[PDB]
Amino acid sequence: LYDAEPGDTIDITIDPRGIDEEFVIAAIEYRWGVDETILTVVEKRGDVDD
Amino acid sequence: ATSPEGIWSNSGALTFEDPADDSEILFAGVRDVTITPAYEHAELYTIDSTFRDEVKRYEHNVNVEITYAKFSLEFAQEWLGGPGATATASQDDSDPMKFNLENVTPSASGGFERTTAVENVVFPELPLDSATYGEYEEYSLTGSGRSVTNLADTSG
Amino acid sequence: ATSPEGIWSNSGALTFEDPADDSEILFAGVRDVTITPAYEHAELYTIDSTFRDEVKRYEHNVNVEITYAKFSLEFAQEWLGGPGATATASQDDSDPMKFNLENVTPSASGGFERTTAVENVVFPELPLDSATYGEYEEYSLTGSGRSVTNLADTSG
Amino acid sequence: ATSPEGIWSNSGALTFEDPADDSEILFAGVRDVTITPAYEHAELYTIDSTFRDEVKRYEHNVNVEITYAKFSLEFAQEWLGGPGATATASQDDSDPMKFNLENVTPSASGGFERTTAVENVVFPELPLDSATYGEYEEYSLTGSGRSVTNLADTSG
Amino acid sequence: DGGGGGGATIDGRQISESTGRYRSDPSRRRGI
Amino acid sequence: DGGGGGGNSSRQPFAGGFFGGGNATIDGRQISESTGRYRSDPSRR
Amino acid sequence: DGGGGGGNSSRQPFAGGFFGGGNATIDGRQISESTGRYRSDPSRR
Amino acid sequence: DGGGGGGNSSRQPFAGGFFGGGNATIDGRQISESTGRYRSDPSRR
Amino acid sequence: PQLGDSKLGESQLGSPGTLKQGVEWTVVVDGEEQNNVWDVQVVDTANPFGDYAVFKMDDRGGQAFEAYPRGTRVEAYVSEGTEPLDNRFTGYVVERRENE
Amino acid sequence: VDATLSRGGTSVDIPLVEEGGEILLSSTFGKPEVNVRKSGGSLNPRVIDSWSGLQTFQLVGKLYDYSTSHQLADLVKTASTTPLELQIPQDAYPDTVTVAPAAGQASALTLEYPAGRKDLVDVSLSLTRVDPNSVRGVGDQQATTPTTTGTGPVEVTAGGTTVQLPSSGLSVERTVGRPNDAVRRVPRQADPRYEVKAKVTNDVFTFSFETLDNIPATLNALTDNVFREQLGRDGVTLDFNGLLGLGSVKAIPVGSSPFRQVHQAGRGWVTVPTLEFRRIYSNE
Amino acid sequence: VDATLSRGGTSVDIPLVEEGGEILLSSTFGKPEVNVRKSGGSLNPRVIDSWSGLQTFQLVGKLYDYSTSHQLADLVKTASTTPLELQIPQDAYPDTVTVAPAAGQASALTLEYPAGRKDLVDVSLSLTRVDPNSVRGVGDQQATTPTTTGTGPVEVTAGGTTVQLPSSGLSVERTVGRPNDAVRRVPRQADPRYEVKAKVTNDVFTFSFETLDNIPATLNALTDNVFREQLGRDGVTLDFNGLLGLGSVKAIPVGSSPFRQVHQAGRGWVTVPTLEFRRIYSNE
Amino acid sequence: VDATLSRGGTSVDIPLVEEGGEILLSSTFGKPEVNVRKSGGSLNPRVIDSWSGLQTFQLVGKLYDYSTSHQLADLVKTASTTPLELQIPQDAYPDTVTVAPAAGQASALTLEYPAGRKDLVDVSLSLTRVDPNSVRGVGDQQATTPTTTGTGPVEVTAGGTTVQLPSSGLSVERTVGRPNDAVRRVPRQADPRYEVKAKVTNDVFTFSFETLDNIPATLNALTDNVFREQLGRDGVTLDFNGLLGLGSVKAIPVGSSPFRQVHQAGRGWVTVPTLEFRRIYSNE
């Protein structure tokens, strides 16, 4: 998903999480090394920075 | 079936062949010959029972041991040379010379002629010199064949 | 090839040589001599069979063992001295004396003359004194050669 | 060099000395004597080859074993006492009595007089009583010296 | 029978200090 | 039996050394999570 | 001591491995506390 | 060969246990850093 | 082989090489590739939150630390398999840090 | 007599036979969920036992055909909410216990196909006891070991190049496990709850052999194409060509020591103590 | 011959004796508190040694009665500011050293009462040297081992139900330690400071036996009432009925493997390699 | 016969010989940097291989000269950006490989000078393969081993007091390594990058011996002056006095178990299994 950006939409299916859905991407994080693309979906919230 | 019968050791005729040719390797003057097909037996036992449940064969070989009193330069140089070659010196290579072996014996009152044949006999060590004061040199081989290729009555 | 033939122990002539010179080291009065080239055998099996798949030679050795009844100061002092030297006392060094060895034996009916030669025989221990009441001193050497350098008919 | 020659066991003359004095320790009635300098041999092989590449000496000792039939109170009380002392009872200390050993033997027809000398021979165990019905008591020592100090023709 | 006989403590200060670089970061990414 | 004597009472403490779980603490308090999940001895191979 | 060829040569690295206690770093800096408490090896059993 | 064999039979799982180095997770996510530095087994001693 | 390394007809054209596989990120600093990089993290996010990237590389004698003054341009390009390089992040340095 | 492991209509009998006096069945019992207090002012600690306990079964036995061995591997690896029932042929145990493959373990099952033996397979199982009414889940994934009737050499294929493993000294060890299932404590059942997950399993093939001929060509063909190249998202195609009845599997070497070349003093050949491949995603 | 271990009026002599050539005394010296720098621009690190060192003793010996063994256990487990003095019968050591049980260990002392060996107890002790003037604390807690004169079987009682452990192959190992004491570095002297704590100790009984008759009944009575029930804050009553002169204690099994039932090929009975109980809150 | 290890003009030949059938050369291949996914909804994991692999060599052999043994120690310990080149005398390997001392190890090289065994040194090397074009660093640090022509006893000096180690049963083991170098993964390339650091190395001397006479005086002189004193920034001075050709070195004992006294049943003397010193800062 290097072509993907925030505000784009994507199909996600996860069993046993029970979701089979189309979501807006609120953020993407790419890791090399562990080679993970991390999608934040629907909305993003902070923590102590909020 | 054929009646069991005595066998007289001195009636035996042992021969060695190169498996590349089926050509005879000169060998003579044996005194003792023992050939013994063998397997490892796993003797399996179960829970609770003290009795053996099953027994299984694995890891077959044929133990061959021969004592002989006439030295053969051909046999010794074939052993040194390894497969399909002959040498006057030790060879620094990993292939042992494999001999096909056959022994033939009449039974003691002519009931049968037992032929035993063994494939790919190899010998870990070869006695070259075996001198003892006041004795003819006596040479003992120990080795292992892959399988018995024939055990039959070869009489007419 | 040459017919196999009996070999008479007392017909043998054993000799030792310094590998630095090819000079003879005086040795005599043998009673027993055994020379046995050997390898370890790796009998290798396979995934789905009880039969042997392949067999391979490794770790070559020539077992030399000699029983003899005439003492040699030269042989004993060569052994003490290590390679290329003689000594009258133990030497505190890590190089053993290496002997070249040759044994020559006629066949019992003169059919061939068998020469066996062995390189770099070493003896882990040297018997100096071997006294037994009412007997001549008799000495046993056990040692290991690197390889057989020659095994041939040396007759004309 | 001197021609090899037979050695008659009964021609031998064994002696023991205290290394603190060079004084003789009374010992007699020998039946057997074996003296054998030895080393551990590290027998070394390479990656590529089935042949031995090298052989090296390490831990040196001289094996001494003696069978004898005349009991000595001095030799026994020296052994009990440890170095430079003599005792009638076992001593609870870690120092073994060290004996200098020498044996002298003419060759069987006078070619040489072989002298063997060994430093710091120690015996792990001393047979005090060795009685068998209808026999004289007979004693066997096994021990280890540090080195051969002398092996020479000591004839005139 | 002789054969038979032959039968983390973690410093709260140093975590709190070493993580400081990173705890403050989201707020820096957002200015203040 | 000669090899088995050394072997068995080696294979036993192999499990004793290998199977010990982590138990980290900050300032006297446990920080390892008390996840109620089991683990049991691996296949003998 | 009689089976020590497999025994002693194993008993020693069992102790050596057991004293391989935990240590940890964040970003090059140590986070293991310098609690000056000793451990000494347990009973041989 | 009971000593030498039992030794080699032990040396392999000693190495296997030694490569069993630490890894850690908070709430299912790894906290161990993906530092791309290699380790390889030490001299045999 | 490389040009002039082999005589004509002796060896087949592309050897010893083969088609690219795996994921590669290249970091570009004022138009120059940094070549000791061993990890990359890129974050792209909706407007209440900042986009950012973190790059990790080896250095010697501070020679690479000198390449990244505050405000220096950085670009991170990604390629997977044989696909073309894609400019996935562009920004400016806000912190350079070197530590043991 | 014999031990049965079964799930609905699928069943395997595991002989529970061994040489001499080896351990056939070790069952362990434990309280992993007791809270023994680490401190407090008394000489001995206060305690609380308040949860289900552990019971483990370790079964050692032999199988007399490869087909049954593959059925056992598939039976263990499968994700299903249908209870896996073990029947133990010893009076100290009930006629059936419900089990999971060992609770957190990558190696719940081991199958060894040693060199020099035919129609013998060494089996080692580790199983955790679980409550029969408390097998829970949603997903369902039948595992299948590929099978074929050939007898070609084992072949490792990568980068368009195929390497035949030597027959000489060839030995196969296969391990199987379900480390992503959860076995969980329950307040006042005796046995724990079992959460079956349609998630990644462990399935590993280990080979040992000795390369006797064409040694550089054989070892270098393997190491060049498998170890020194990057394999991307794909991996080795490991094909048994019908040895042990096995077919073709996609796999990869994993970790610091999946392959080793060993050279011994005085031996004119090379030993491979391990060549180890984990099976990868190809169940599409 | 004997080492003497004593605390005020209480004293125990331990024969430093063992078979053949076994280790009787191992003394280990170390510097846990040297700082060797992990990096820096030198070829060889800078260092700083600035604290008390470590000295440890392992004593192996034998005791000739059970009464002395219980005295030794009570002496080692007891909390008191009264210095525990060790006298070593060997010239490489001073006439007395002040000691703590092994500094952080659950098993400072082990006592083994093996099958066959009447009136022999194997002792293994581990002790840390401490500064004689630097034994510090507030609370005294005299430990006690309960004793009785009976000859009955070892009994495990839980849920009103009693199991008798088989006499056949019965061996006892007891281990004792004080892991909650602190042995601490001090800057100016050779030996560390010892902080004696009136806090929880370790005290464990391990049984080993072979179950020969009434095998389901015996093992099921143990596993049902101890391992499958929840024990609450009470536990097993473990009663020696006067074997080794021991009485009765409250105890519990702890952790993943405190009990194992082992079945061997060709044997008509069950081995129990271990059955472990930790002593729990009891004193008043 | 020999393997050759070299650094520009400096070169050492290591015979690669051993007794009987011992391992001379192990080469291990691996993929430390594959990402096998721990979870996901497949039966078998998705994977990605995207980085350089690992290749390691363990070499075992003997040296016939102490001088060469010191050259080998200096060669391994030295920091230089000049490639360290290994030549292996077996046809599977290329004629040269570039290497680092084992990537993260305190013990990359071990030299054993056992009792007996005049002019024999056991060598064990662990080496990691690295890319020949990818050796990087600031600058060199030539390591050296002090040498002298004497024959005196090994002397340990601290607090102005010198202690001679017994000759009886004496063995020396020296270990050397470069744990502060970095061997790093690279994309799209076979072998890792090597970062040579002008930083702290590992260099340790271990002694084993038996004290036979003046036992309290010898062991107390060692323990009082080395172990029971605080040494400060300065080390012990360890002087070989020309044994093995070695000179004088500043060093310190480190950690929990650097020294042991062992007493065995029925023996009138003390064994020292290990006395272990790490070489400290001493370069100007």
Residue numbers in the entry:
A (entry chain BF): 303 to 352
B (entry chain B4), C (entry chain B5), D (entry chain B6): 2 to 157
E (entry chain QF): 294 to 300, 317 to 341
F (entry chain QE), G (entry chain QG), H (entry chain QI): 294 to 338
I (entry chain BF): 2 to 101
J (entry chain BB), K (entry chain BA), L (entry chain BC): 2 to 285
Task: Reproduce text from the manuscript describing this model.
Here, we present the near-atomic resolution structure of Haloferax tailed virus 1 (HFTV1), an archaeal virus thriving in extreme salinity. Through single-particle analysis, we obtained near-atomic resolution maps of DNA-filled and empty virions, enabling us to assemble full atomic models of the virus pre- and post-DNA release, including all structural protein components. The full atomic structure revealed that the virus has a length of 1350 Å and an icosahedral head with a diameter of ~600 Å. The tail has a length of 560 Å and terminates into a baseplate with three radiating TFs of ~190 Å in length.
(A) Full structure of the tail consisting of a dodecameric head-tail connector (HTC), a hexameric tail completion protein (TCP), 11 tail tube (TTP) hexamers, a trimeric baseplate-tail connector (BTC), a trimeric baseplate hub (BPH), and three trimeric tail fibers (TFs). The tail region begins with dodecameric gp26 [head-tail connector (HTC)], which interacts with the PP to maintain a conduit through which DNA can pass. This is followed by hexameric gp29 [tail completion protein (TCP)], and subsequently, 11 copies of hexameric gp35 [tail tube protein (TTP)] making up the bulk of the tail. Each hexameric segment of the tail is rotationally offset from the next by 23.6°. The tail forms a hollow tunnel of 36 Å in diameter. In the DNA-filled virus, this tunnel houses gp40 (TMP), a hexameric coiled-coil structure with alternating C-terminal conformations. The TMP extends from the central channel of the first TTP near the portal to a cavity in gp44 [baseplate hub (BPH)]. The coiled-coil region of the TMP precisely aligns with the 11 tail tube rings, confirming that its length dictates tail tube length. In addition, we observe two densities between the DNA and the TMP, located within the TCP and HTC proteins. Because of its location between the TMP and DNA, we name this protein the TMP-DNA spacer (TDS). The TMP and dsDNA are separated by a spacer (TDS), and the dsDNA traverses through the portal into the capsid.
